[PDB]
Design an enzyme around this catalytic site. Sequence first.
Site, PDB file in Angstrom:
ATOM      1  N   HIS A  43       0.792  -1.238   0.000  1.00  0.00           N
ATOM      2  CA  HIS A  43       0.000   0.000   0.000  1.00  0.00           C
ATOM      3  C   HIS A  43       0.825   1.290   0.000  1.00  0.00           C
ATOM      4  CE1 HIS A  43      -2.857  -3.034   1.571  1.00  0.00           C
ATOM      5  NE2 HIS A  43      -3.810  -2.275   1.054  1.00  0.00           N
ATOM      6  N   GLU A  88       3.171  -2.241   7.383  1.00  0.00           N
ATOM      7  CA  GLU A  88       4.036  -2.073   6.232  1.00  0.00           C
ATOM      8  C   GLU A  88       5.276  -1.269   6.613  1.00  0.00           C
ATOM      9  OE1 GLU A  88       1.800  -1.143   2.671  1.00  0.00           O
ATOM     10  OE2 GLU A  88       0.505  -2.901   2.999  1.00  0.00           O
ATOM     11  N   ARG A 141     -22.387  10.340  20.937  1.00  0.00           N
ATOM     12  CA  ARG A 141     -23.027  11.499  20.310  1.00  0.00           C
ATOM     13  C   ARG A 141     -24.432  11.174  19.826  1.00  0.00           C
ATOM     14  NH1 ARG A 141     -18.880  15.327  17.209  1.00  0.00           N
ATOM     15  NH2 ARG A 141     -20.842  16.518  17.205  1.00  0.00           N
ATOM     16  N   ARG A 186     -16.014  18.919  25.118  1.00  0.00           N
ATOM     17  CA  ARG A 186     -17.465  18.817  25.121  1.00  0.00           C
ATOM     18  C   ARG A 186     -18.064  19.243  26.453  1.00  0.00           C
ATOM     19  NH1 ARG A 186     -18.271  12.858  22.583  1.00  0.00           N
ATOM     20  NH2 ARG A 186     -20.478  13.154  23.122  1.00  0.00           N
TER      21      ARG A 186
END
Lengths: 238, 240, 245, 248, 252, 244
Positions: D6, D78, D166, D221
């Site tokens: 990748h 990787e 949430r 929050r």
Amino acid sequence: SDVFHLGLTKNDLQGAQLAIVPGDPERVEKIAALMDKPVKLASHREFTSWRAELDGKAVIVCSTGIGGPSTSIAVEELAQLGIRTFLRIGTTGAIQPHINVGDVLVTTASVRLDGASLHFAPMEFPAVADFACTTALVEAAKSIGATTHVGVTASSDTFYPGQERYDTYSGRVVRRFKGSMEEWQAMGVMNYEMESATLLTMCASQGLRAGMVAGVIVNRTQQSHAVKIVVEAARRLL
Amino acid sequence: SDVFHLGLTKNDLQGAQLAIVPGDPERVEKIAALMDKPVKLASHREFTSWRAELDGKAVIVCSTGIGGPSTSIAVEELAQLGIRTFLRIGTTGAIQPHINVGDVLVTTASVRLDGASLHFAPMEFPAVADFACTTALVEAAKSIGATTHVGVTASSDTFYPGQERYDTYSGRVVRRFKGSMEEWQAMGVMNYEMESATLLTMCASQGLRAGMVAGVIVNRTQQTESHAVKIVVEAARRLL
Amino acid sequence: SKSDVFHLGLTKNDLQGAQLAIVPGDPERVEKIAALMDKPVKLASHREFTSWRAELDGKAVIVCSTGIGGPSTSIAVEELAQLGIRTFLRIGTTGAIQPHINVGDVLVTTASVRLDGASLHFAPMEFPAVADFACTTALVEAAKSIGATTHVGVTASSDTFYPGQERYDTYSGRVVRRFKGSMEEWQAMGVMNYEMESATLLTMCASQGLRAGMVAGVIVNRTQQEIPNASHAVKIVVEAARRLL
Amino acid sequence: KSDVFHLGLTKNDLQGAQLAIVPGDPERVEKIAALMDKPVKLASHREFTSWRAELDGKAVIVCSTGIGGPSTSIAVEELAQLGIRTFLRIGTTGAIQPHINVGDVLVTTASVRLDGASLHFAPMEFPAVADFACTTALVEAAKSIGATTHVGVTASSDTFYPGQERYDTYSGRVVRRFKGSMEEWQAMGVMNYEMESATLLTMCASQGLRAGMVAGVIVNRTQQNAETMKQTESHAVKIVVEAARRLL
Amino acid sequence: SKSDVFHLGLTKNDLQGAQLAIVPGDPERVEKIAALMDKPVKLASHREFTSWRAELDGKAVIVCSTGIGGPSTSIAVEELAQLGIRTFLRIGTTGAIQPHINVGDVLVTTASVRLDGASLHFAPMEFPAVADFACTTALVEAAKSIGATTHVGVTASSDTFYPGQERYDTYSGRVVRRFKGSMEEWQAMGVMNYEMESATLLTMCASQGLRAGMVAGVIVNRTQQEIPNAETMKQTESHAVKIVVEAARRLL
Amino acid sequence: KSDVFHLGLTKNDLQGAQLAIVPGDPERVEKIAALMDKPVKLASHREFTSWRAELDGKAVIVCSTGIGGPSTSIAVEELAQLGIRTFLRIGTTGAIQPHINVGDVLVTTASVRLDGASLHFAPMEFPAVADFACTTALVEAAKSIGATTHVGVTASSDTFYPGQERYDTYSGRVVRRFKGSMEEWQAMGVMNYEMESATLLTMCASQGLRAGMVAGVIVNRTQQEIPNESHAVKIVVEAARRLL
């Protein structure tokens, strides 16, 4: 922006209610181009979005990135924006020897080897595709004479150990996944991918329609088609 | 006799490869009688079996009893005798307010609230129906103009607490099931029944084809068996 | 009369005050067991639930079938409890998994391995599928009174007859990972036998203030074969019933 | 051309590097590499953008992971194949504790595993724990520039929405598992939510790789942006590079 | 028989302002550890809970045994917390499972594999049984002051001495499926050792605002052939013990 | 010398004993052994204090287990290695049923497995069930001694505090799994809480050893959280008599 990640407003969708959702941002424009009036909307992280038109109706094409978590953000925010039908298009290997490169796979449901699906429904709940979407994909496949397999896909949170790959740094696979590929093979699972358990579970448990088609490009048990199918399927679902 | 529970031999099936499987032994003969040349084969425990013919092809009708465990015995033993396609036909209530009595439900996949399905595949595996069977059922329902809902069913190992019923001896529902009906409702689950998770999982995991259709006889909110039966037989014609 | 319950087709009147039920798996065994008692009368037959009433030492007793498996058993037990039954004695058939247990032997279950799903609808897995001490005592002492070869201990109670009891002579020939090698494991842990109803019965009774006992006759020895080629337990369950009225 | 599936990288591209700084966002990669010597672009494929640079004469990699454990697991595997043995995650985050302020720095000792990918490397019983040397280097780098630093447990979620409890969503529903969960983590002293660290820490801790994580707090929050995030960004970035210096 | 707590037989006055406790498993080790500090005095002994108080650099410190296992550990930690203790240092003995970890080595645990049950009474399995960074830092630095061959990493914390540590040398000679082949698994995952209290201690502290650390001396290696004598095992203990007391000094 | 790792006992020390009485508190060992003939102290190490005695001419061991399944699993295993095949636990317990009084005697038929050590011997599906003979012995002994006795299921917890839903604690809170759990067990007919029986019963029942469990009620949890015994101890000794 009406949403936190995608950079879109409801207005941008121009009444779109269906989205085709590939993984890779670089496939988006290519897919949108098969439809009329393709125009780019936004591009943020692995979420690239384009709008086009199919028989007068607006349609969205938006990439998900790799994996359930990225996918769950895209579906949630597209839903907020009004999308009600999601069609996943991908390329895939396969784990059944009777499945050849060039074949087309339509997924009725997925083995939940992920984590994000559990944030929407407990494990007992099936990661199942919408019947209308699956029907549309299968018949779209038939109409272009594609060789198609319809069945179960295994959806893994990893590319390596969850697909029982040993050609890795550690060369080890945790107990849970040792011998697992042979087990899925025996149970008739067609293939592995990494997003469908999250996609199907979150949609099936939230009143959204989801479907998935993939083109087979490799097969570890051996030594444009799929895109046409997904767009053809999309017009039957508008 | 070959198989241990059903008392059937391969010869009894006369080449049958499809079985219609209701829950109630007493419904077996009724279903067989809608087809040609119905003949009783055997009756043992909750397993009553008849053979009949549909478009010149032999078909089986065999009852399963209530629940995954007896269902699993019937499907296993029928598969041993050559059956490869299974169509469950049931009666059912519903958990969605808009689903009416007289409506027919086609199940795409089931919530696995049973135990027997785990003896065939781990919980991560989907209790999913065969596409061809589900298609045949849906198309057969269009054919007779029934009002059909297609989607997910919750398949429970109990009639009472697993379906969050409190009108019971103890009045108690164990923590796992308290509030569970509301949960399934919000997730779009259509209905409860007691066999499909086992049927669908055992079949989807062993190369067997299975589908399920059910007629709604009542609604948990707010409180045509022949129509569901007509659909299952017509679907069977398309799967022979 | 309009039935008092949804599946059994019985009214409280039908029980004539009975507070104990003998519960075989097979509907066809119900008449046979009631025949061993006084004034046997057929009550009803719906689905896999055949029920008879009889009398023991002047006391009314119910014999009612459960069908195979936890789910149908859970319906019969719940509805019988609604009708007034407070004591349940299962009489079944079983596959032995210990080499010295002979076909025909009587096994009395103290508690079960919960390889079922219905038990979980009554109590979480940590709760023991344990038999009532009075019921077990009555069964053991009855088995002693008639001199039957009897074993007392733990039973494995499965939601399937095939893979969950690690049978390989099947259509697929495969057993899911969870059950591969499981019989040898239960064998080493001293488990006596496999059957299919006791985990549900014992769990739902012990967690709801109901008394339950479990006895079964051996019909195959699994250290030797998966399926047999092709009564003491019954006399015992009736005699134990007598002691629990 | 490539030695891995990748990343689009060869061992040669790393020039002997054994340490990678791993942000989530490809856009941050160049910015991080820019604080070090001889920075240069390597490759960009999907969400994996890599740059190489040098600290005190030794090569270092900066490589993005994308969002979530699955894409993180590909990058870590990787990179390990290419020779990386130490991974430092750098993020920006919210906080769930009333007394963790915007501008603060969080160094994670271990994570609550609310993800799926970690289970592909070790069973749930195994701790998603950071390496001691990495955590030490991060905490010491944070002190050397006078940040307000919190060191402790982070909750690592496969989702941005329901897994972080949430309700401002399409369905407005949170599954039973996560109903009331934020309050529970708060009472247990969990500092924050993010989405990659359970996978990163578990996969490294169970395969003999060293991993650490630092994040800057940009929102809270329970407390109720523009230039501040940039300011906070720059600060945690400074810290992760100073930590890498100690780890070479 | 004044006690502020149900099991330990201690009052707040007994602690004399102590906020740190050193917690070995064996009650017999308590007096020995206390003897490394100033003016130690015995406080109480009930069941497996023996407690002493001493001074370290002028400040009161408690040494209190936990007994074997998470359940008795959980009682000791909860009750010491009620009494005012905020920092806990476990000092143990251990079996190493890595071939390169020699008898005489000292292990500092960063976090533990939760092969116990009591930890789940404090936090669901997803929560990490992780040590406090300050305690772990203190132990690592103390090891450097004392001079020791130290390894820092993950420990497997088991509710049993026998099957959970995959011992077959037992009455039954069997190990349940879950633990069959498990030692090789933990070995490949880099786990240093087994012991029996740390998952409970670390989880219950990390989820309740208490600081905990863990240090152990290696008395045997499960991969080696030669079993050290009980005598040379005593010296290893003494070594780890010196380190835990030195670590305590940095945490007061 | 010792033939086992923790207990400090040799086979010869047991003098052919095949039954052990296993209390939790090492300090109670001497007391129990005194009720029998020829009591002799054997060893004391960690929480394991062991005495030998004689009952109707046969050797019997009394050995403490300490608190909890892990130390219990050590004592049982090592006693088994030395030849013990029958184990009778005698404990103290908190009742959770309104109708069970302080001073009553509880005999456990099986336990709710709220522990971890039991899982090291059998998966959760396996029942933590007592041996029928031992249970019968205890029930008959309770008749002989005279005691208000209840027989049934016990909840066996790896903790004294949150697992028994106690709130008189430093945090004053209980993890989700145990919130509201006491009332759940009460509704399921569970008699009482203690801390060793799940491990003892599971490890014995799954290994061909016989075990039984009896306890004296020291508090009723429907009235009081922190407490505020002879009947129960006379019963376990009398039961031992019947199991020889």
